[PDB]
Amino acid sequence: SSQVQLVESGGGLVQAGGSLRLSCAASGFPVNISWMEWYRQVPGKEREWVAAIQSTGSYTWYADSVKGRFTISRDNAKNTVYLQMNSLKPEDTAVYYCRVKVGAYYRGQGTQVTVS
Amino acid sequence: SSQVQLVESGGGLVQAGGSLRLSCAASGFPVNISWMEWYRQVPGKEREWVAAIQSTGSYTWYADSVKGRFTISRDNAKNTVYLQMNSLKPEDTAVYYCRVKVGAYYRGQGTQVTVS
Amino acid sequence: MITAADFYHVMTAMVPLYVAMILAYGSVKWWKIFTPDQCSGINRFVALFAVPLLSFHFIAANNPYAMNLRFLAADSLQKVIVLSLLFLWCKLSRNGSLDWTITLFSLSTLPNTLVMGIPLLKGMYGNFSGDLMVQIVVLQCIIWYTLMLFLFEYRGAKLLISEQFPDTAGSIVSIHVDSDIMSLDGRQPLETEAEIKEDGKLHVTVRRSNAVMPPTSVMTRLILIMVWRKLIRNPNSYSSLFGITWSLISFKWNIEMPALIAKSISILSDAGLGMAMFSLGLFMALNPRIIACGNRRAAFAAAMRFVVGPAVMLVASYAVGLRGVLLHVAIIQAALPQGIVPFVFAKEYNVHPDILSTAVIFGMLIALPITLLYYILLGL
Amino acid sequence: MITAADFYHVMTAMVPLYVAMILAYGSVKWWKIFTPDQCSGINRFVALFAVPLLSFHFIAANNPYAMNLRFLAADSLQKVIVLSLLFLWCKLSRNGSLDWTITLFSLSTLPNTLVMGIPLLKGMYGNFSGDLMVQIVVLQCIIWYTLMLFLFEYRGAKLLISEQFPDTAGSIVSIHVDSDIMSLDGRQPLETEAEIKEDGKLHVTVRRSNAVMPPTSVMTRLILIMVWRKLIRNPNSYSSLFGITWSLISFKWNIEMPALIAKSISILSDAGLGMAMFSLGLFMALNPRIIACGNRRAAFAAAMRFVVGPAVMLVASYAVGLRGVLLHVAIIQAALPQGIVPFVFAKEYNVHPDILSTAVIFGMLIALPITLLYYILLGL
């Protein structure tokens, strides 16, 4: 078991109209199936989902507002995915954190997503 | 009123493969609408309808077995229709009698339809 | 007279009836327990099983050899004074119809005595007064609800012949109706057909289709056929047939019904009073509004029932010679709300199905403050 | 002993119950009166209104200060001998499950005493024997049907955690269930979610989706939440709460219930015995066959009930010290047919819904020639 752990990095205060690089480094699991996600959280309610690097990369369900602008990698041996944003709009001060599925959705909390 | 009357003529014993000429001479009515019919009656049950000289001659609903072989006339001033059979099959020994509509279907009984 | 002790006996008999109704109205309108297709299965159980077994229980315990013939002849005189003034309108005036004389006789003279009438009068005047109400139910089931099948069937058989035989119907000598057809209003195609005989006399045959007046010996056979076919398909005619038949045998030779049979009947007839009121609250939740016909006529349907009804029986019950307490029973049984059985006939045959809908429903709600106003004023 | 006079008192109590059932079976199977969507509205009226008001009538007239504590401790000892031999199977053997120990406890020890049991015993031994049957209904409603909600909820909450947390579930410290979800079997998607804290301890939250074992202090809070949510949505827990509460007040200070309230309750509870049997015949007409599970198991569902049931209570009622007539009441109440309430639990949660279906239906048909065989043999 070895105390199954999620670590997240890439937060910071940047200028509107740039590029950021988030990460989700999973470790210490059973056989991991790829359904890894990312979603936003404002202090208000009614959150929404962003990306997907699901089973074999055949379909990646993006949101309706960020169609065709976010690059999502995969490395099954390294077991870490990256969320690459491009052309940062100012309405991106939410909370982004990954949701890897091993049958039950696991997650953490630790990001610093903000933009001017 | 004058005792509303139906008369029918044209019955006889003929040879199979000929032509007969029935009639239905209506008389003594109110304004007569054209829905005049003819149908067969064997001594058995489950009878079926034959011809129609309905409203203005746009569609004449024939039976499925005598499609395109029976000539049906109309004369609104004479108020008498004719049922002209052609190429008499032997299975035509039923009872043929007309069914003129003046809102309620009126009919008679008097024919002698038979064939060898 | 009216002590506050009698006001508690009246409320003990009637407050249980409204509790069963407002839990049914609440169940569909406020808390959504019943689907409208599930309400149809509860109304059909009450109309076929609970209510025909409830009236067998009352009629078979009546004594037909000790009926009160002076009380029961003042109620038959009400429905002759009413029905004879509706004959003089239909004949002197030109705006009188036959649709209105079936409505105005059932909104004057046919109250709800089986479900509301027997508990109410028995709590106001005693146990003799709830036995007089059973004798009125015997006459409604066996006489007055059979003259109103004759009027609906004559009304339907005249809208067929006068509509399809407008210039010829004086020569019809025989009318035959096929056994597949029960009611000849507009539900099936109803292909009618005439056979011209050797004199010119028509021989009408009504068939069911696929995909002047006639002589009074011909119209009187068409109706008796069709009254008979809707009288054997009715559960409330076997409740009245076997109820009166057992009651003539039991009270002459003093024969009690055995305990196997009397408990086999009583297991479903105990469900009859409580679910007759539960089913009437499911009706008022499925209508769109309570006052369904409009305020102009709902004030007319409630003035025929609570004013013209008990005023044409004050005249009828004083001419026969009732006085004292039987006069007070007979003017308070005429101010009961509208019965249910005339509401079933007007829905089937469509003859004012809304004026008889807002008289059953809206009549139940306002019938107590109006039967309590007569009782505080008659015992004054 | 058994004169032919007693055989007529037993038939007077039971033949009314089969007449109400075969008219419901006939109505859908032979004469087609009710659509299958109309039968669903009659079963829902009985399950929510008639039967909860029938058991309030019996419990609120019980005297809790004069219960028979020797008779009532021999029935609690039956369900300890049974339930402790099902613990020694589940633990010594490898083919024992938890699905079978919920079925074998409800087919041995839970008979139908509310509807059939109180009329039957009261016709066989007198009016004291139909008062002992009310005291058993008080214990079933308040104790034994609440230990069987604890077992169905523990069985469902173990098929969720062991299925979605197969290698990690030893580190769960808190489980939260959202208020939209009542039962966590497979009806909704049930998206579960875990929050990894700073130590590596998971914090599980069960959400409803769109479009080793945990420690025993964590599983014991998940169950008590979910037992509570299905216990306030149940009509048969207010019938038991207000029934026992009024009964403790009435029989100490000698307070009678007033006549407005006692007749408002009795107008729907009189409908309760007759339509509990009418609704059970609508069930046997909607099943495809009567013996629904096959002949191999229908002979096993009727040997647990009529043989193992009254043999584990001959042992329990002789050790406590009952003799004479109370021993004969206690062996004849255990051979009653299968109750209805365990049939509702097995249908919702799908745990043998057919063995408990052919024990309610086929048990009613053969229960009389079997409770009459014990009574002719005990009074020998």
Side-chain angles (χ1 to χ4, degrees), chain A, chain B, chain C residues 1-211 213-380, chain D residues 1-211 213-380:
Chain A
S1 178
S2 178
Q3 299 294 320
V4 48
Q5 189 62 256
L6 263 291
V7 289
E8 291 175 352
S9 295
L13 191 148
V14 294
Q15 186 60 256
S19 66
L20 292 174
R21 184 177 181 270
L22 296 175
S23 66
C24 176
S27 177
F29 280 99
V31 176
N32 190 0
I33 62 170
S34 62
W35 194 264
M36 299 182 187
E37 296 176 356
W38 292 88
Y39 61 89
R40 69 176 67 252
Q41 180 63 40
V42 298
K45 63 181 74 174
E46 295 293 326
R47 70 185 190 269
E48 66 184 2
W49 292 344
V50 175
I53 192 64
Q54 297 175 357
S55 178
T56 180
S58 293
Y59 64 98
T60 62
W61 179 258
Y62 290 169
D64 290 330
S65 65
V66 291
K67 292 181 180 179
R69 60 181 290 163
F70 287 164
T71 300
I72 291 93
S73 177
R74 186 180 68 187
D75 195 356
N76 295 114
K78 186 167 69 70
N79 199 358
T80 299
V81 295
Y82 294 100
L83 179 62
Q84 184 66 40
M85 282 77 77
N86 288 316
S87 68
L88 293 172
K89 300 184 293 295
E91 60 272 16
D92 294 330
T93 61
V95 184
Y96 292 170
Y97 48 90
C98 59
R99 194 182 174 87
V100 59
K101 180 184 192 294
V102 195
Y105 291 151
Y106 294 177
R107 65 171 170 88
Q109 72 274 18
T111 195
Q112 194 62 40
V113 175
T114 185
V115 69
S116 66
Chain B
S1 178
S2 178
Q3 299 294 320
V4 48
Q5 189 62 256
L6 263 291
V7 289
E8 291 175 352
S9 295
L13 191 148
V14 294
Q15 186 60 256
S19 66
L20 292 174
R21 184 177 181 270
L22 296 175
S23 66
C24 176
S27 177
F29 280 99
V31 176
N32 190 0
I33 61 170
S34 62
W35 194 264
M36 299 182 187
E37 296 176 356
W38 292 88
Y39 61 89
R40 69 176 67 252
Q41 180 63 40
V42 298
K45 63 181 74 174
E46 295 293 326
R47 70 186 190 269
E48 66 184 2
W49 292 344
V50 175
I53 192 64
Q54 297 175 357
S55 178
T56 180
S58 293
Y59 64 98
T60 62
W61 179 258
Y62 290 169
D64 290 330
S65 65
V66 291
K67 292 181 180 179
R69 60 181 290 163
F70 287 164
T71 300
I72 291 93
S73 177
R74 186 180 68 187
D75 195 356
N76 295 114
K78 186 167 69 70
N79 199 358
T80 299
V81 295
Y82 294 100
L83 179 62
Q84 184 66 40
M85 282 77 77
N86 288 316
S87 69
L88 293 172
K89 300 184 293 295
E91 60 272 16
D92 294 330
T93 61
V95 184
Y96 292 170
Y97 48 90
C98 59
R99 194 182 174 87
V100 59
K101 180 184 192 294
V102 195
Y105 291 151
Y106 294 177
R107 65 171 170 88
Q109 72 274 18
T111 195
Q112 194 62 40
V113 175
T114 185
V115 69
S116 66
Chain C
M1 58 136 234
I2 326 300
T3 59
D6 292 327
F7 181 76
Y8 181 74
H9 287 287
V10 181
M11 292 291 106
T12 308
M14 299 306 296
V15 175
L17 297 181
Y18 291 97
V19 170
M21 211 196 36
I22 305 168
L23 288 203
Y25 178 75
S27 64
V28 200
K29 272 254 172 74
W30 301 326
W31 303 299
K32 293 179 179 179
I33 298 171
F34 293 101
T35 304
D37 203 1
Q38 289 181 352
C39 294
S40 175
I42 299 168
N43 293 121
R44 188 167 178 83
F45 178 72
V46 173
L48 297 179
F49 289 98
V51 174
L53 283 169
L54 181 63
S55 69
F56 180 78
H57 175 70
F58 281 143
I59 294 171
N62 196 17
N63 194 358
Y65 302 105
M67 301 181 83
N68 194 358
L69 296 176
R70 181 172 288 171
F71 183 81
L72 201 64
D75 175 69
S76 298
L77 187 61
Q78 176 189 4
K79 302 177 178 64
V80 172
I81 298 169
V82 172
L83 191 60
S84 178
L85 295 173
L86 296 173
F87 177 75
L88 271 67
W89 173 50
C90 183
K91 189 258 287 183
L92 273 73
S93 295
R94 64 179 177 88
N95 53 2
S97 68
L98 199 146
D99 297 334
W100 284 105
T101 66
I102 307 169
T103 302
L104 295 176
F105 178 80
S106 295
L107 282 174
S108 296
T109 56
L110 294 176
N112 191 2
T113 60
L114 179 64
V115 173
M116 179 171 167
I118 299 170
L120 178 60
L121 266 292
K122 187 166 68 178
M124 297 164 82
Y125 294 104
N127 284 317
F128 72 98
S129 180
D131 267 346
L132 292 173
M133 290 294 106
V134 178
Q135 300 174 1
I136 287 172
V137 172
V138 174
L139 270 73
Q140 284 180 356
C141 292
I142 211 70
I143 292 169
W144 300 113
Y145 282 165
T146 71
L147 166 69
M148 228 172 46
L149 177 63
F150 274 90
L151 292 173
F152 281 112
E153 299 294 326
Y154 174 74
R155 185 255 186 188
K158 185 172 69 68
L159 296 178
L160 181 142
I161 294 170
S162 179
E163 192 266 329
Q164 289 182 177
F165 295 99
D167 293 332
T168 318
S171 297
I172 294 171
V173 303
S174 180
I175 298 172
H176 291 164
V177 176
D178 291 332
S179 63
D180 199 4
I181 302 170
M182 280 77 76
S183 296
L184 44 75
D185 49 358
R187 296 180 187 271
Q188 294 87 12
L190 269 71
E191 177 176 0
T192 64
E193 184 181 3
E195 170 69 24
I196 298 170
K197 302 298 289 182
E198 65 185 2
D199 191 76
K201 302 294 179 69
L202 277 73
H203 190 277
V204 178
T205 308
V206 176
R207 207 148 261 107
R208 186 201 285 237
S209 198
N210 289 337
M213 288 303 292
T216 187
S217 176
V218 175
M219 293 294 289
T220 190
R221 295 177 68 190
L222 175 59
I223 297 168
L224 291 175
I225 291 302
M226 309 265 296
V227 169
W228 174 250
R229 294 182 181 179
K230 291 189 71 65
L231 201 62
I232 61 171
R233 269 69 172 266
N234 197 357
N236 290 111
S237 66
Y238 300 97
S239 172
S240 303
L241 185 68
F242 298 119
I244 298 170
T245 304
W246 177 251
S247 182
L248 293 167
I249 301 170
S250 172
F251 282 92
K252 185 175 174 66
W253 294 283
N254 294 116
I255 296 170
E256 293 89 6
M257 189 179 284
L260 280 172
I261 300 100
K263 295 292 182 70
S264 300
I265 295 169
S266 176
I267 191 166
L268 274 308
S269 73
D270 286 335
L273 178 61
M275 291 196 296
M277 297 302 297
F278 194 84
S279 172
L280 196 147
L282 296 176
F283 279 151
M284 69 178 288
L286 294 171
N287 290 115
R289 291 185 290 116
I290 297 170
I291 300 171
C293 64
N295 292 317
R296 183 70 61 85
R297 298 177 195 244
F300 177 75
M304 298 297 290
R305 184 84 281 279
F306 299 111
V307 174
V308 177
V312 80
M313 200 170 180
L314 181 64
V315 171
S317 172
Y318 186 79
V320 174
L322 292 178
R323 312 269 135 76
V325 179
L326 292 179
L327 180 60
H328 296 173
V329 180
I331 305 174
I332 274 143
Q333 73 99 15
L336 290 173
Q338 181 64 39
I340 320 282
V341 180
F343 171 61
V344 178
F345 284 102
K347 191 187 292 183
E348 294 179 355
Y349 289 105
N350 192 31
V351 192
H352 307 139
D354 289 330
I355 298 173
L356 284 170
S357 176
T358 184
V360 178
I361 297 301
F362 181 75
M364 282 299 298
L365 298 179
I366 62 163
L368 227 45
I370 299 201
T371 64
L372 267 68
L373 186 60
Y374 286 158
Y375 167 73
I376 291 180
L377 287 206
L378 267 63
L380 189 146
Chain D
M1 58 136 234
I2 326 300
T3 59
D6 292 327
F7 181 76
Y8 182 74
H9 287 287
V10 181
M11 292 291 106
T12 308
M14 299 306 296
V15 175
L17 297 181
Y18 291 97
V19 170
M21 211 196 36
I22 305 168
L23 288 203
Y25 178 75
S27 64
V28 200
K29 272 254 172 74
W30 301 326
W31 303 299
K32 293 179 179 179
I33 298 171
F34 293 101
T35 304
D37 203 1
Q38 289 181 352
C39 294
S40 175
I42 299 168
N43 293 121
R44 188 167 178 83
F45 178 72
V46 173
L48 297 179
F49 289 98
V51 174
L53 283 169
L54 181 63
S55 69
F56 180 77
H57 175 70
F58 281 143
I59 294 171
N62 196 17
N63 194 358
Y65 302 105
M67 301 181 83
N68 194 358
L69 296 176
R70 181 172 288 171
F71 183 81
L72 201 64
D75 175 69
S76 298
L77 187 61
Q78 176 189 4
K79 302 177 178 63
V80 172
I81 298 169
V82 172
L83 191 60
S84 178
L85 295 173
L86 296 173
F87 177 75
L88 271 67
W89 173 50
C90 183
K91 189 258 287 183
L92 273 73
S93 295
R94 64 179 177 88
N95 53 2
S97 68
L98 199 146
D99 297 334
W100 284 105
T101 66
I102 307 169
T103 302
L104 295 176
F105 178 80
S106 295
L107 282 174
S108 296
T109 56
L110 294 176
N112 191 2
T113 60
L114 179 64
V115 173
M116 178 171 167
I118 299 170
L120 178 60
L121 266 292
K122 186 166 68 178
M124 297 164 82
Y125 294 105
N127 284 316
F128 72 98
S129 180
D131 267 346
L132 292 173
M133 290 294 106
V134 178
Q135 300 174 1
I136 287 172
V137 172
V138 174
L139 270 73
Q140 284 180 356
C141 292
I142 211 70
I143 292 169
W144 300 113
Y145 282 165
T146 71
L147 166 69
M148 228 172 46
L149 177 63
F150 274 90
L151 293 173
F152 281 112
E153 299 294 326
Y154 174 74
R155 185 255 186 188
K158 185 172 69 68
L159 296 178
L160 181 142
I161 294 170
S162 178
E163 192 266 329
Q164 289 182 177
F165 295 99
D167 293 332
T168 318
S171 297
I172 294 171
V173 303
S174 180
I175 298 172
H176 291 164
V177 176
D178 291 332
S179 62
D180 199 4
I181 302 170
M182 280 77 76
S183 296
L184 44 75
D185 49 358
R187 296 180 187 271
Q188 294 87 12
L190 269 71
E191 177 176 0
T192 64
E193 184 181 3
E195 170 69 24
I196 298 170
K197 302 298 289 182
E198 65 185 2
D199 191 76
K201 302 294 179 69
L202 277 73
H203 190 277
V204 178
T205 308
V206 176
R207 207 148 261 107
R208 186 201 285 237
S209 198
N210 289 337
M213 288 303 291
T216 187
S217 176
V218 175
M219 293 294 289
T220 190
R221 295 177 68 190
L222 175 59
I223 297 168
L224 291 175
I225 291 302
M226 309 265 296
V227 169
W228 174 250
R229 294 182 181 179
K230 291 189 71 65
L231 201 62
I232 61 171
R233 269 69 172 266
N234 197 357
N236 290 111
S237 66
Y238 300 97
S239 172
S240 303
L241 185 68
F242 298 119
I244 298 170
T245 304
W246 177 251
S247 182
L248 293 167
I249 301 170
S250 172
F251 282 92
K252 185 175 174 66
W253 294 283
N254 294 116
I255 296 170
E256 293 89 6
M257 189 178 284
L260 280 172
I261 300 100
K263 295 292 182 70
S264 300
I265 295 169
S266 176
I267 191 166
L268 274 307
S269 73
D270 286 335
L273 178 61
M275 291 196 296
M277 297 302 297
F278 194 84
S279 173
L280 196 147
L282 296 176
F283 279 151
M284 69 178 288
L286 294 171
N287 290 115
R289 291 185 290 116
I290 297 170
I291 300 171
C293 64
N295 292 317
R296 183 70 61 85
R297 298 177 195 244
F300 177 75
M304 298 297 290
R305 184 84 281 279
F306 299 111
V307 174
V308 177
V312 80
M313 200 170 180
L314 181 63
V315 171
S317 172
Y318 186 79
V320 175
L322 292 178
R323 312 270 135 76
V325 179
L326 292 179
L327 180 60
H328 296 173
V329 180
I331 305 174
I332 274 143
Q333 73 99 15
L336 290 173
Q338 181 64 39
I340 320 282
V341 180
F343 171 61
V344 178
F345 284 102
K347 191 187 292 183
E348 294 179 355
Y349 289 105
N350 192 31
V351 192
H352 307 139
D354 289 330
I355 298 173
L356 284 170
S357 176
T358 184
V360 178
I361 297 301
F362 181 75
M364 282 299 297
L365 298 179
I366 62 163
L368 227 45
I370 299 201
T371 64
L372 267 68
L373 186 60
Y374 286 158
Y375 167 73
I376 291 180
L377 287 205
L378 267 63
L380 189 146

